[PDB]
From a paper:
RbdA shows an (β/α)8-type barrel fold with an inverted first beta-strand. In the structure, RbdA forms a dimer across helices α5 and α6, Fig. 1A. The RbdA-PDE dimer is observed with a single metal and no substrate c-di-GMP or product pGpG bound. Three metal binding sites have been identified in EAL-type phosphodiesterases. Nucleotide-free EAL-PDE structures typically contain one metal in what was called the M1 position, and this is also observed for dimeric nucleotide free RbdA, Fig. 2B. Metal coordination in RbdA involves the side chains of Glu585, Asn646, Glu678, Asp708, and two water molecules, leading to an octahedral binding geometry. RbdA forms a dimer interface of 715.8 Å2, as calculated by PISA. Instead, the PDE interfaces with the PAS domains (interface area 865.0 Å2) and the DGC domains (interface area 223.3 Å2). These interfaces with PAS/DGC domains in the autoinhibited state overlap with the interface in the dimeric form of RbdA, Fig. 1B, suggesting complex formation is mutually exclusive. The shorter helix is a hallmark structural change that was previously linked to activation as it allows engagement of the β5–α5 loop with metal cofactors in the active site. The structure of the dimeric RbdA PDE presented here is primed for substrate binding.
Residue numbers in the entry:
A (entry chain A): 546 to 576, 579 to 797
B (entry chain B): 546 to 797
């Protein structure tokens, strides 16, 4: 569709509350901190059906609308953490991972928007871990370095997901002080059958060791794969074998 | 200079024997007495007043005017001729692996396989003695073409290497599709690997993925014995550079 069409669609979905956040648990694999989750965005269309990412994110990102979606995500995430904490039965979240678009890392107004949300929701910055794909960070490196350093001065943590998807040099990493490398799911799914996938997981584990970074495996779909990641020394696991995404935003 | 200027210059240098080959030794780092002396041939050009001409003062012009296939053809013929003369000398150290660099132009040239076939017929070098070498950059920039090239040479019995491995803007995915025998790690990583643990890590990682994908590894620019020892411990297969042996005259 057109520019105008996609601006309306994103605006309308925001207006009708058709975006929602789920929280997927991330479990430690070694020897204890609070609950670790990653927030996942869901969009339902006007007739109530799930819209898969590939049916809206590519169009939104072409028109720079992912700034709007990220701003909604962060506000609603913070609000939900606060409202959640007012239920004394809910267990505290120690790490709440939130994905950001490349458009957001290139937006110089974002730091101010975030600073204000921290003040208003009284969130300890250290509890938030912002997450960008390796690909997006590397394609926009000058932006990512400055972005990550500004946010780190705020006190929050940082993650690269889809890590090693481009099987590239990790030299750039000397300039991004991120805390976590989250292994691309493609490598985890087939690491038991395909020795390249296994090797890539060992490599990532090794970068973690050398750079004092912690690692997370995405797409951990069986307990056998979980066990192999544990043996290698991967720090955390996420996916179908660990626990389902749960409603987070009300 | 002009097209005609560079045609003349390259021809004249060929005519006056001002191109020459040197051989730099490449040492095994691991166990096994299999295979004799491993070398890489290096091209040098001297000008009319006897001074070396650095690569960047002639390769770009040759590439620009499509003269590089001709220079490579000279390199390979002269390498073969020298290997034969060396084999006839009972005192000379036998060569098990002679590595010859080729240009991107040559990987795209379908007349090269026929020229090489003819050189094997005439000079009767055992093909398995030859290892052709192209940079990763050049191979990946022309991937389908490199695959065809490497497989045709492989059917001849020759081996293959990618040098300047992991220089610039590269990915390991391509490697699964390039049936080469050796990866030669770029010297950028090796030079500072004792001081910089990122460079060290990158050497270990390359060695790891290379081994898992069926390749033997070579480190270039090994400048001290301590660097050689560190590469040995990691499991790098071969070393090359100042601590191992300087280039020696090869072509008469
Ligand atoms: Mg993520
Ligand atoms: Mg070479």
């Amino acid at each position: 569709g057109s520019h105008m069409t996609w601006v309306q669609r994103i605006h309308l979905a925001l207006e009708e509350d058709r975006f929602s956040l789920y929280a997927q648990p991330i479990v430690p694999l070694g020897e204890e901190e609070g609950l670790h989750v990653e927030l996942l965005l869901r969009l339902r269309d006007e007739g109530g059906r799930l819209v898969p990412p590939l049916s809206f994110i590519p169009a939104a990102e072409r028109y720079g609308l992912m700034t709007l979606i990220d701003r909604w995500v962060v506000e609603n995430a913070f609000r939900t953490l606060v409202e959640r904490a007012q239920d004394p039965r809910a267990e505290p979240i120690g790490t709440c991972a939130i994905n950001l678009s490349g458009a957001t890392i290139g937006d110089e107004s974002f730091l101010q928007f975030l600073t204000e949300l921290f003040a208003r929701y009284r969130i300890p910055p250290q509890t938030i871990c912002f997450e960008v794909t390796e690909t997006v960070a590397v394609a926009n490196l000058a932006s990512a370095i400055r972005f990550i350093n500004e946010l780190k001065d705020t006190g929050c943590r940082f993650s690269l997901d889809d890590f090693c998807a481009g099987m590239s040099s990790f030299i750039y990493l000397k300039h991004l002080p991120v805390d976590y490398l989250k292994i691309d799911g493609s490598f985890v799914k087939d690491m038991l059958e395909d020795p390249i996938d296994r090797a890539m997981v060992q490599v990532i584990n090794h970068i973690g060791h050398v750079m004092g970074k912690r690692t997370i495996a995405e797409f951990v779909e069986t307990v056998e794969v979980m066990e192999a990641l544990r043996e290698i020394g991967i720090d955390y696991a996420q996916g179908l074998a660990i626990g389902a995404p749960l409603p987070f935003s009300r």
